[PDB]
Amino acid sequence: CDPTDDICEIGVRMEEQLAKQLMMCKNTRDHHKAMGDVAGMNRFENLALTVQKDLDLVRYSKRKNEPLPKFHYEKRSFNIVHCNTDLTDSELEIVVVRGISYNVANPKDVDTYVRVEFPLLNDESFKTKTNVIRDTSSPDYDERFKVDIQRTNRQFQRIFKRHGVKFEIYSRGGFLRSDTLIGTVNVKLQPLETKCEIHDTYDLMDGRKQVGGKLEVKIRVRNPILTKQMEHITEKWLVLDA
């Protein structure tokens, strides 16, 4: 749009608003899917469907040359403050789930453990580690660690915006033998600004250089960092007439 063309810009914002609403539908749908909640899942998929229809209607009016569709505001109940109720408002949880086929020299008794480093106030702190699984290239750690955050501190918001959690995978050197760094995994925290968990599997790295196997990890909060402004969107749900 030309910067003086206000009706054009309204049209752009209509589409942006609906695209943001679509994103919220899919995210929430995906949270309910991950939690074995079939009914919430279909619910927010159906909400996504209606948002997409309106998105298509607006794009179509623009593809031809018709007036923008009339619209109005409604509300939608997302329950953003209450996904992962198992967690305090102040709590971030890290789950080291499993290693997958580390590229080591041993088959069995490769013995492994994972160190976790989570940045805290005035860089940094919080460090911990998993137990030592024994005798497998594909370990099944299943350990959860909780830490305290301050959503209020703008430098904690810094950390979620820009920074991440470091996972170091170590082989347990035996008698008079030190431990070997098998590989590193670094997971950015910023998806937690609008989502309430990260869950993926990541390649063990050396540099700059993929090592071999993978590590599967979860990072979970009670609600997204930017829950407050997500709620504002849900209070003015843009919906086309009719």
Swiss-Prot record:
Lineage: Eukaryota, Metazoa, Ecdysozoa, Arthropoda, Hexapoda
Function according to Swiss-Prot or TrEMBL: Phosphatidyl inositol monophosphate binding protein involved in endosomal protein sorting through regulation of the endosomal sorting required for transport (ESCRT) pathway. Required for full activity of the ESCRT-III complex core component shrb/shrub, probably by preventing its inappropriate polymerisation. Required, but not essential, for the efficient generation of intraluminal vesicles (ILVs) in multivesicular bodies (MVBs). Involved in a late stage of the endosomal pathway targeting transmembrane proteins of the plasma membrane for lysosomal degradation.
Protein name: Coiled-coil and C2 domain-containing protein 1-like
Domain C2 positions: 63-202
Oligomeric form and interacting partners: Interacts (via DM14 domains 1 and 3) with shrb; the interaction is direct and blocks access to the surface involved in shrb polymerization. This interaction may be required for the ESCRT-III complex role in multivesicular body formation.
Organism for this UniProt entry: Drosophila melanogaster
Organism domain of life: Eukaryota
Free-text note regarding domains: The C2 domain mediates interaction with monophosphorylated phosphatidylinositols PtdIns[3]P, PtdIns[4]P and PtdIns[5]P, and is required for membrane interaction. C2 domains can mediate membrane interactions in a Ca(2+)-dependent or -independent manner; the l(2)gd1 C2 domain lacks three out of five asparagines that are crucial for Ca(2+) binding. The C2 domain is required for protein stability and cytoplasmic localization, and is essential for l(2)gd1 function. Contains 4 tandem repeats of the DM14 domain that mediate interaction with the ESCRT-III complex component shrb. The 4 DM14 domains show functional redundancy, particularly domains 1 and 3, however domain 3 is necessary and sufficient for l(2)gd1 function. DM14 domain 3 forms an alpha-helical hairpin loop with a positively charged surface patch that binds a negatively charged surface patch on shrb.
Reported phenotype of the disruption mutant: Results in abnormal vein, eye, and bristle development probably due to defective regulation of the Notch signaling pathway, particularly in imaginal disk cells. Accumulation of proteins in enlarged late endosomes, including N/Notch, possibly contributing to ligand-independent ectopic activation of the Notch signaling pathway. Failure or delay of abscission during germline stem-cell division resulting in multi-cell cysts that share a cytoplasm.
Family: Belongs to the CC2D1 family.
Subcellular location: Cytoplasm; Cytoplasm, Cytosol; Apicolateral cell membrane; Cytoplasm, Cell cortex
